[PDB]
Amino acid sequence: KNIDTVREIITVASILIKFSREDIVENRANFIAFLNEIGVTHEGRKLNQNSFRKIVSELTQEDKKTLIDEFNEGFEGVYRYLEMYTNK
DNA sequence: CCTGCATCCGTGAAACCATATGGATTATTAAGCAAAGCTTCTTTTC
């Protein structure tokens, strides 16, 4: 379904903020322009801000859990250091 | 002067005035923004 399109969204976000290029995620319209030029596609077309908030909105809680769990896999070296000093 | 004793010092187990002043705080406004809502094009139904 659309869940796979969201998977490529967060994966491109993972590469994007992983390679020290941050400022293009927090602003939204330029980010959607970036996603449209790299050629992601939900239902045969480009991405609208309404369409973006729908596809983020129309979404299941367990799938969201799956997406953040998949997202945390690249950022493992940060989290091991993060929790090694919090084992109280 | 140099051999010979003493010791002793270390060492561990008040109030105000005045005057700037600028930095800190508050108000005030332009920008912007997410969310909503027209307007037309497809898409699905009988």
DSSP code per residue over chain A: -HHHHHHHHHHHHHHHHHTT--HHHHSSHHHHHHHHHHT--SSSS---HHHHHHHHHS--HHHHHHHHHHHTTT-HHHHHHHHHT---
**Distance, angstroms, CA A59 to C1' B39?**
28
- Cα–Cα distance, A25 to A71 (Å, whole number): 15
CATH homologous superfamily for the domain A1-88? Anti-Sigma Factor A (1.10.1810.10)
Cβ-based contacts with strand B at under 7 Å: A 28, 50, 53
Neighbour tally for A68: CB within 10 Å: 9
**Distance, angstroms, CA A23 to C1' B23?**
32
Domain edges within chain A: 1-88
